[PDB]
Ligand binder design. Sequence first.
Ligand SMILES: CC(C)(COP(=O)(O)OP(=O)(O)OC[C@H]1O[C@@H](n2cnc3c(N)ncnc32)[C@H](O)[C@@H]1OP(=O)(O)O)[C@@H](O)C(=O)NCCC(=O)NCCS
Ligand SMILES: CC(C)(COP(=O)(O)OP(=O)(O)OC[C@H]1O[C@@H](n2cnc3c(N)ncnc32)[C@H](O)[C@@H]1OP(=O)(O)O)[C@@H](O)C(=O)NCCC(=O)NCCS
Ligand SMILES: CC(C)(COP(=O)(O)OP(=O)(O)OC[C@H]1O[C@@H](n2cnc3c(N)ncnc32)[C@H](O)[C@@H]1OP(=O)(O)O)[C@@H](O)C(=O)NCCC(=O)NCCS
Ligand SMILES: CC(C)(COP(=O)(O)OP(=O)(O)OC[C@H]1O[C@@H](n2cnc3c(N)ncnc32)[C@H](O)[C@@H]1OP(=O)(O)O)[C@@H](O)C(=O)NCCC(=O)NCCS
Lengths: 245, 245, 245, 245
Amino acid sequence: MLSNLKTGNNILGLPEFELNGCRFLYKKGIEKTIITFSAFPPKDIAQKYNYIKDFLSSNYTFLAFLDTKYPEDDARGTYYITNELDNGYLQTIHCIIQLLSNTNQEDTYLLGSSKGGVGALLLGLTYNYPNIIINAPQAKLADYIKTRSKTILSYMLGTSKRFQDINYDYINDFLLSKIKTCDSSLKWNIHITCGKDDSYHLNELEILKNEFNIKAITIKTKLISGGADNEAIAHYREYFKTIIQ
Amino acid sequence: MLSNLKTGNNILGLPEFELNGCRFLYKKGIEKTIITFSAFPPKDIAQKYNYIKDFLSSNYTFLAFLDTKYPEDDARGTYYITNELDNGYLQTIHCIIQLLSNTNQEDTYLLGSSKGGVGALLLGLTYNYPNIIINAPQAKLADYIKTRSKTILSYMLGTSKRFQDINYDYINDFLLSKIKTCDSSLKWNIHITCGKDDSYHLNELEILKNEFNIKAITIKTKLISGGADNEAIAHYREYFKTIIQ
Amino acid sequence: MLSNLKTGNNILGLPEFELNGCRFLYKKGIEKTIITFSAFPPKDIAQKYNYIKDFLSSNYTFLAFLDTKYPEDDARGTYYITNELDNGYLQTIHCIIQLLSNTNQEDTYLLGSSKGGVGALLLGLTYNYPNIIINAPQAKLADYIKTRSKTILSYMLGTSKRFQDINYDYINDFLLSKIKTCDSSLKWNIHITCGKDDSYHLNELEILKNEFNIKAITIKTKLISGGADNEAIAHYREYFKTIIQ
Amino acid sequence: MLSNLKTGNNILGLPEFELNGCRFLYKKGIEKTIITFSAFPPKDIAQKYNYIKDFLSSNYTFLAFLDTKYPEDDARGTYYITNELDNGYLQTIHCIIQLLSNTNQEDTYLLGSSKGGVGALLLGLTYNYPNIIINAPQAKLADYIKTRSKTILSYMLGTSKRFQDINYDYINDFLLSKIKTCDSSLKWNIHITCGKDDSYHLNELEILKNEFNIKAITIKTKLISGGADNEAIAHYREYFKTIIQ
Ligand SMILES: CC(C)(COP(=O)(O)OP(=O)(O)OC[C@H]1O[C@@H](n2cnc3c(N)ncnc32)[C@H](O)[C@@H]1OP(=O)(O)O)[C@@H](O)C(=O)NCCC(=O)NCCS
Ligand SMILES: CC(C)(COP(=O)(O)OP(=O)(O)OC[C@H]1O[C@@H](n2cnc3c(N)ncnc32)[C@H](O)[C@@H]1OP(=O)(O)O)[C@@H](O)C(=O)NCCC(=O)NCCS
Ligand SMILES: CC(C)(COP(=O)(O)OP(=O)(O)OC[C@H]1O[C@@H](n2cnc3c(N)ncnc32)[C@H](O)[C@@H]1OP(=O)(O)O)[C@@H](O)C(=O)NCCC(=O)NCCS
Ligand SMILES: CC(C)(COP(=O)(O)OP(=O)(O)OC[C@H]1O[C@@H](n2cnc3c(N)ncnc32)[C@H](O)[C@@H]1OP(=O)(O)O)[C@@H](O)C(=O)NCCC(=O)NCCS
C-alpha cells in the first residue's frame, strides 16, 4: 500500500516514499505526468529531488526520483545503475511510474539536468518513454564519476582486480549501449540543451549525437547561454517549461 | 497507467494486465489482499491463475500472478526465477502488490500449491510478507523441474557445459537460500499443508522445516488427506479459507 | 569438394576457402608445408593472412588461416578458441592441414606473431606439430584480450555473472593448459623470438618457458632487436626464413 | 598428408585411415560420391564398414566411416555423438568428405542401415547433404542403446547422477532435434525403407515422420519384405542400388 512505503520525510509538503531502495515523491494530478531525476549533489550533501518548484502550482501528476542509496560512505548515487550493474533500479522506477501515473507515455515527460539527464535517458531509452527533455548529460559515465568520487567509482568497479577495468568500460558505455539497443521505430521526442560554455558536456553531446545518428534517431539540441552553472540551469528550466506548455 | 497495461484478456470477472513480462489479474476490494501464484501446468496446457473462484464472492482485494513467459518452447514458467537466476521477476511482483494493494502487509495473504507455493515462499521470504499459506512446495527445485521438462531446466541452466553443475545447485537451493537469508525477527505466519500420502513432498517439507528450524522460524504444518492429487488440493482450499477467516 | 569451398576472394596469387567457419588460403607446392596464423588486427581492420609474401617465391605448400568470425560486433577473432571455449576450431584447422598437405609432419612449419603465435602453439601442442616458430605470443590470454576489446572477452566469457570469473581463468590459462597436457616425448622444435625491448611479452615468454621447463620440453628462444613493433617483426621474418632453410 | 593417416588395416584392398579418432576407408573415383556409415555390431565384434561390396565394381568415389572408438571396454560406437555429447565427430566426418570428395553435395549419397542410418541422417541434417538413403533408423537413440549395452549407455550418461537423466533425454532426442533445426529450404532427397515385420522400427519411423511433417519436409518411405533381419537388408541394398543408378 503506497502510504505504508512512506519514509517520514516531507519535501515542500510532498511525502517521500521508498520502494525497493528507490526513493520518490508523488503527487496525483491530471493531463500530464512530469518525472524528474536527481542530479549529482556536492560532496557530503544529501541527494535532492530537482525541479519541484517548477511544477508546484501545476495541476499535472508529478513524480521525482532519487538515485541509489549506495555506497553508504558516499551515498550520492550510482547513476541509476545497480550494484549488480544492471537495470534493477530502472525497472523499479518504471513499475512505480506505470502503476501510479494516470496518463499514457506520450503525455509523460522525463526531466533532469546532469546525472539526472542521464537517468532520464536510461529510463526513457529502456522502457520507451518518448518525451525526454534534459540538459548537459554525461556520455562517458565512469570517466565523469572518477572526477567526483573515488569511493563511488571503486564501489561500482567491484572488489576483483581482474574485472575492474571491464566493469569500468561497461559503466562508461552504459548509456551509449542504451542508445544502441533502443527501439528506433518509436517516435522519440528527445530534447538536449547545453550551455554554450560547457565545453566538457558539448563534447559529451557530440558523442551522444553520433550514437543516435548511427541508430537513425533524430533529436533536437539547443545551445543556451551559460556554462556548467546555474545560468545554463536557468535557461534549461525555461526551455522545458515552454515545451511542456 | 494501469489501464494501458491491459492485455485484452479477461479471466472470469477480472481483467488481465502485463508489466515487465509479469502477467497478473487484479480486482480492488477491501479488508484483505489475497495473492495467488500459478502452479506448474501439465504439458501443453497454458499457465493458469489459481484459486480465483475461492474469492469471487469475497470482496477482498485480489491479485493472481503467472510465472515467467520463457522458454518459449515450454513456456510454463521458471519457478519465478529470472533467466539470470535472480530476483528480477519477484521484484516486479513486489512493486505491483505494494502499489496496488490497499491493505497492510499483515492483512495480505500469499497462496499457492506446488510451484505456486514456491513462488509464495520466494516472494514472502524476500520481501517480508508474513502470511504464507501453501500446499506441498518443492524444496530442491532443479531435482523437481528436471522430472517435468528438460527444456526449462536446460534454459535456466545456461549454455556453458562447465557451469551446468554450478547453476544446478544454485537453482536447486534457490528457495533454501531465501530461508537461510530471511529476517528471523518477522512475526512469520507460515502454513504449509501436504497430503498424508504425498511421500515426495512430505520429504520436501522436512527439508524446508529443517531450514526454518535453524533460523528459529516456527511454521504451522498440517497433514491433509490425499497425496499429490486433487483431494489434497480440496483440503488445502478448505484450510486456507478457514485460516483467512 | 575443395573447389566448392571457395569464397570467391583471391588474396595475391591464392584463392580463399571456407570450411566450417574456418577461412584459409591454400596453394600446393613441394618439399615443405608452411602454415601461418592471423595475428590480432588493429581496431576496425579486417583479419589478414600473415607472411604470404615470404613464401610466394618458395614453391612450398602454403596454407594461411584466419581466426573465428565471431563476435560479429568486433570480428577480429577469439584466439582460435570456439565460443564454447573448446578445440572445435583448432580441430577443423587440423583436418584441413592433414588432408591437404603433401608432406610429413616434420616437414611442416607453424608460423605466427602475437595472437598468430598463440594459434600456432595451440594447434601444434594439441595435435603434435613439432616445428613451431613464432614471435612474442601472449601467455595469459584473457589479461591481454581485455586490453584490446572488451566485446570479444565478454563474448568468450558468456552471459552468466557467476561464471565470468571461472571462464576468465579458463581462457587466461587455455594456452598454459595445452603445455601442461602436451606430449613430452615429441621431438619438439619450438622457436620463440621476442623483441629485446618488448618487456610485456618478454615476461609472457618466461611464463611460457616455465611451463615448458617443467614438462621437460627444451625450446629455443632468441631476443631480437625492437619491442612490440615492426622492427621485431622484420627480425622475426628473417629468423624463420633462416631456420626453414 | 592422407597417407600418413593410415592405420595399417586393409579391407578388401582399401587402406584404412584415421583422423581425430575417426576411422574411414577412401577410394577416389568419378561422377558420384558414395558414403556409408557403420551399424551396431554384435557384442565383442569389431565395428565394420558396411556396403563396400555393393560398390567394389563401381567407378564412384567411395568413403566408409566407423563410429567413435569409446567406451574402450565396449568400443562399438556412441552413435556418432562425442563423449562431450556434441557434433565433434560429425564435424570431422564432414571435413574429411568435403576435402577428399571430387563431387558436389547433390552427387553425394549417404547410406546406412541401422545405427548407420542414424549416422547418415545426423551428418546429412547437420551439414546439408541432400541425398540420404537409409533403412530402419532408430529414433529414440538412448532407449535403443539401453537394450544393447549398459557399458556404452553409462559411459555416455556420464559420472554425475544429477545429469544422467538429463544426458539420457538429450541423447534420446539427439536425432529429433537435428530434424527440428535443419534447413527446411533445402531440396532434401531422404528415402527411408523398413521391413514390414520390423514393428519396433516402424514405430521409430512414425516418430521421425512426425518431426519431418512439423518441419514441412517431404520424405519418401517404402515398406520392404523382411523384418529386422537380412531379408530387409537385402531389399534395402537393391533399393539404394537402383536409386543411385
Ligand atoms: C538548480 C537547483 C539548485 C534549483 O533549485 P530550486 O530553484 O530551489 O528548485 P527545486 O525544484 O530543485 O527545489 C529544491 C527544494 O526542495 C529541497 N529539497 C530537494 N530535495 C530534498 C530532499 N531529499 N530533502 C529535503 N529537501 C529537499 C531543496 O533543498 C530545495 O529547498 P530549499 O528551498 O530549502 O532550498 C536544483 O534544481 C539543482 O541543483 N539541479 C541540478 C543542477 C545540475 O544539474 N548539476 C550540478 C552538479 S554537476
Ligand atoms: C484446482 C484447479 C485444478 C482448478 O480448480 P477450480 O475449481 O477451477 O478454481 P480456480 O479458481 O483455480 O479456476 C481457474 C479459472 O480461471 C480460468 N483461467 C485461469 N487462467 C486462465 C488464462 N490464462 N486464460 C483463460 N482462462 C484462465 C480457468 O480457465 C478457470 O476458469 P473455468 O474453469 O471456469 O473455465 C486449479 O486451481 C489448479 O490448477 N491448481 C493447481 C494445484 C497444483 O498443485 N497443480 C500442480 C500439480 S503437480
Ligand atoms: C608484417 C605485416 C604488417 C605486413 O607485412 P607484408 O609485407 O604486407 O607481408 P604479408 O605477406 O603479411 O602481406 C599480406 C598481404 O595479403 C593481403 N591480405 C591479407 N589478408 C587479406 C584479406 N582477408 N583480404 C584481402 N587481402 C588480404 C594483404 O592486403 C596484403 O596484401 P598487399 O599489402 O600487397 O595489398 C603483416 O604480416 C602483419 O600484419 N603481421 C602481424 C605482426 C603482429 O604481431 N601484429 C599484431 C601486433 S599486436
Ligand atoms: C548385411 C551385411 C552383413 C552384409 O555383409 P556383406 O554382404 O559381406 O557386404 P559388405 O559390403 O558390408 O562387406 C563386409 C566385408 O568387409 C569386411 N569388413 C568390414 N569392415 C571390416 C573391418 N573394420 N575390418 C576388417 N574387415 C571388415 C567384412 O567382414 C566383410 O568381409 P567378409 O567377406 O570376410 O565377411 C553388412 O552390410 C551388415 O551387417 N550391415 C548392417 C546390418 C544392420 O543394419 N543391423 C544389424 C544390427 S541391429
